[PDB]
Amino acid sequence: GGWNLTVNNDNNTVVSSGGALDLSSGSKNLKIVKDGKKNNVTFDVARDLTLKSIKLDGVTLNETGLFIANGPQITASGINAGSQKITGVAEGTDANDAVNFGQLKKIETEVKEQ
Amino acid sequence: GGWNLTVNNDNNTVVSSGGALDLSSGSKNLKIVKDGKKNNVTFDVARDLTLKSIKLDGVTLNETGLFIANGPQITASGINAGSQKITGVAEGTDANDAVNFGQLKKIETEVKEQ
Amino acid sequence: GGWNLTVNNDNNTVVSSGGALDLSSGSKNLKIVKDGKKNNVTFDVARDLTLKSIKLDGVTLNETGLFIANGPQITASGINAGSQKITGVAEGTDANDAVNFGQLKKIETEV
């Protein structure tokens, strides 16, 4: 006595009378806490994770960046707007700011009589 | 010789002498592996997760996209700049590249003579 | 009793005959479920997480936004395109839409 342990319905491993079982974490992403006074074990996910990828339906975040299926991609090579409009853009003020359509139309109306 | 098991201080049950306990993963997001050679069970977070949402204070990543609270968002429908400028934009040269303000100013300038 | 329980090979205690062991989660981010009176326990990551940060090599997601090392960032201050082109922009039609180079060239040609 002697109880049987299974994991994911694998085979019995006996934990015998006077025997032992060790529970361990594979990485810093999973915390397992126990002390020497009580049997109690607490498991948790780290609040700062290190991951290879995350899938959220058509949204993927990975080591290269953010990808949305049939949508934008954001990587170290830059922003791909996904063949979609970019909306909510404040007017550009510096040479290296994006311009919005209101700015383009102002210059169009000027150039036609300037 | 039995022993009593609770999970989150609940669902109290006896694991009797000769009885059995299974520990399983609810999904691919959490890996659990037994090594019966040394009576160890290792637990870890998968490095590739499938999730519904992540909240980091005002930042949300979910199945629709990336959201900054009251600010920019990136979804399949496109990028919303949040009524802020888009900075650090290089000059467009292909049809679907964004235009920066320096390009608009160059065209405004070149039509002085013409 | 009894059998010996360690975590990461440390903190041994004896789960004695007639003793008790509790397995609990430390936060809402980890789900541990016992199947009632059944001796099976399931562990999983919550599908909705609350985190401080995630690092994926040079990509960081945190409470400020999304950052790519040597690349763009997206925060409450706005989007920085990383001193690089923005590609794949559909033509703007409303006042606050971005405009693409084809639109700029169209107006250059018209004059």
Numbering used by the authors:
A (entry chain A), B (entry chain C): 385 to 498
C (entry chain B): 385 to 495
Excerpt from the paper describing this PDB structure:
In Proteobacteria, colonization of the host depends on a wide range of adhesive surface molecules, among which Trimeric Autotransporter Adhesins (TAAs) represent a major class. All TAAs follow a head-stalk-anchor architecture in the direction from amino- to carboxy-terminus of the protein. The head, which is projected above the cell surface by the stalk, mediates a range of molecular interactions such as autoagglutination and attachment to host tissue, typically via proteins of the extracellular matrix, e.g. collagen, fibronectin, or laminin. Of the experimentally studied TAAs, Bartonella henselae BadA is the longest representative, at over 3000 residues, and extends approx. 240 nm from the bacterial cell surface.
